Amino acid sequence: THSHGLFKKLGIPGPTPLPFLGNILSYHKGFCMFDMECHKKYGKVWGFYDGQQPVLAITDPDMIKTVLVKECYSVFTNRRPFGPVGFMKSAISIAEDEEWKRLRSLLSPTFTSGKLKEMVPIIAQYGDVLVRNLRREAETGKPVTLKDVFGAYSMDVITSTSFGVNIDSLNPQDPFVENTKKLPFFLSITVFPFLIPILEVLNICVFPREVTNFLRKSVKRMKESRLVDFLQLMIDSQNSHKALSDLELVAQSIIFIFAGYETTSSVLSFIMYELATHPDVQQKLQEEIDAVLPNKAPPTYDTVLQMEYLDMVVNETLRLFPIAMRLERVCKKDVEINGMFIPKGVVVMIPSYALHRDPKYWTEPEKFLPERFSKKNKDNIDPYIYTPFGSGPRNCIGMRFALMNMKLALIRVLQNFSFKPCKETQIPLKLSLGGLLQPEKPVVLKVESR
Numbered sequence: 377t378h379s380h381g382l383f384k385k386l387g388i389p390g391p392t393p394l395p396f397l398g399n400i401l402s403y404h405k406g407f408c409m410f411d412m413e414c415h416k417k418y419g420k421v422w423g424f425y426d427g428q429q430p431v432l433a434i435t436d437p438d439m440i441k442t443v444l445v446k447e448c449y450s451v452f453t454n455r456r457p458f459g460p461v462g463f464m465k466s467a468i469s470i471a472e473d474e475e476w477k478r479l480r481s482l483l484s485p486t487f488t489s490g491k492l493k494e495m496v497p498i499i500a501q502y503g504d505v506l507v508r509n510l511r512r513e514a515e516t517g518k519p520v521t522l523k524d525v526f527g528a529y530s531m532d533v534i535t536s537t538s539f540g541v542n543i544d545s546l547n548p549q550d551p552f553v554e555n556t557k558k559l560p561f562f563l564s565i566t567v568f569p570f571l572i573p574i575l576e577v578l579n580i581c582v583f584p585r586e587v588t589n590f591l592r593k594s595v596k597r598m599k600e601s602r603l604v605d606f607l608q609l610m611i612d613s614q615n616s617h618k619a620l621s622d623l624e625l626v627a628q629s630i631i632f633i634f635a636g637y638e639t640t641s642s643v644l645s646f647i648m649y650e651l652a653t654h655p656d657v658q659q660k661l662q663e664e665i666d667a668v669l670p671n672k673a674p675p676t677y678d679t680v681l682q683m684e685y686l687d688m689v690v691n692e693t694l695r696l697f698p699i700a701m702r703l704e705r706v707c708k709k710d711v712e713i714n715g716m717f718i719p720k721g722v723v724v725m726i727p728s729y730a731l732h733r734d735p736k737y738w739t740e741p742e743k744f745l746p747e748r749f750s751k752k753n754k755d756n757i758d759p760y761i762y763t764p765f766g767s768g769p770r771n772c773i774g775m776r777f778a779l780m781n782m783k784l785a786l787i788r789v790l791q792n793f794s795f796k797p798c799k800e801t802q803i804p805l806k807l808s809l810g811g812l813l814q815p816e817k818p819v820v821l822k823v824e825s826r
């Protein structure tokens with residue numbers, strides 16, 4: 377301190393920081409709106425402060441490629457630290473430098489296309505659970521809270537694809553549904569991040585210290601009972617890198633569970649909102665599914681990859697609602713990328729949400745228009761502008777699994793039901809002014825049987 381002269385010095389523009397707070401008062405309308413304003417106010421690069429922490433936004437595709445791919449192992453390797461984490465320091469999304477590179481290696485083969493084709497029959501069976509829990513609400517002409525029913529399915533696939541456990545968590549108190557339920561503080565970190573090590577010597581975990589105590593033992597119950605799913609594929613790996621330890625493995629289990637719980641369910645809710653508020657896209661998708669799977673035939677790994685309009689709908693939804701909002705890398709050395717000095721310790725940020733809604737790359741960016749991703753037009757889309765799964769060595773490892781999971785859900789559900797707005801549906805949907813990509817009011821819709 378005071379780091380607050382850095383961008384003034386480097387000749388990089390940006391909003392003037394308040395003492396201690398930096399620019400965080402500007403987060404009151406949410407990360408997203410702040411980024412969009414800076415992008416129009418300042419242009420291709422700018423700089424702000426989360427407390428004393430300098431953040432350099434970049435929006436040049438080449439420069440973004442340099443950061444995320446070209447200079448990844450050398451400079452922009454780790455994400456911005458947050459804490460206290462405790463033993464979750466060993467989770468892949470959290471770990472750093474060579475220990476991350478190791479965890480990335482030991483867990484990469486789990487996420488292969490071939491391993492994912494063997495999860496399809498299991499992910500298929502809960503697609504049926506999802507339809508019956510839907511019909512019980514459709515036959516009773518009462519509006520439906522999509523996050524609950526998508527959450528219950530997304531919860532079902534996680535427990536199954538990651539440990540073998542098999543519940544219809546919507547309807548009992550099966551010993552597993554509840555510890556995963558615990559699925560203001562985090563803003564006080566930003567002004568006082570010098571207090572993270574304080575909390576790390578106090579063993580306060582941002583992960584409720586009890587959930588983790590439940591699964592550290594629950595895994596070693598499963599580990600010593602067996603002795604097709606993620607835990608097996610990880611136990612099988614630990615049989616050039618030091619093999620995955622037992623606590624290390626639990627920490628990955630925790631990452632996968634959250635990674636694909638609120639994500640899968642949130643995205644599915646954004647897609648169903650768009651398909652209800654655009655009934656022709658919905659009909660057109662329903663037709664393509666009936667063309668590929670006539671007589672409500674069950675989707676397989678290969679018929680899913682055949683559905684091009686389904687892919688367009690998923691991609692365009694993620695353009696509008698990229699649930700990460702930003703990508704970030706901590707610059708670990710004095711570097712120069714594409715003619716611009718970047719001093720060590722700066723956090724480099726890619727404003728994905730702003731870049732997805734930039735009129736300078738998107739005609740009518742607020743409109744939901746799947747055709748942007750027609751095989752005709754899909755080629756003009758800059759892949760360092762549309763980045764819903766990141767890019768380079770540290771992108772979303774669960775990308776293909778998440779696309780596959782969501783699409784199986786949609787096919788099964790669109791085969792059987794159409795989706796209409798209720799009077800209680802929020803149109804236009806508004807994003808949580810807070811810190812997550814979720815709707816302000818939950819998405820509720822009328823569900824009717826075909």
Ligand code: HEM
Nearest residue numbers: 469632635636639700764765766767770771772773774778
């Ligand atoms: C629609 C669903 C999802 C979306 C849009 C999404 C998006 C992202 C993004 C943007 C990142 C940061 C990438 C970067 O920094 O370049 C990321 C990281 C990550 N994601 Fe996902 N994600 C989704 C679901 C999942 C799922 C289901 C898993 C399940 C295993 C998963 C596992 C991970 C991991 C482990 C990382 C950190 C990877 C690393 O640092 O090595 N994600 N995701």
Ligand SMILES: CC(C)(C)OC(=O)N[C@@H](CS[C@H](Cc1ccccc1)C(=O)NCc1cccnc1)Cc1ccccc1
Nearest residue numbers: 458467469470559562630631634635636639699700772811
């Ligand atoms: C800075 C602030 C306090 C505002 O929020 C964060 O601290 N958020 C990141 C920090 S790691 C996060 C750890 C985690 C585990 C369980 C519950 C919550 C969080 C993680 O592994 N999530 C996986 C994931 C989630 C979503 C998609 N794909 C994968 C989460 C993250 C974002 C983007 C890429 C990678 C991680």
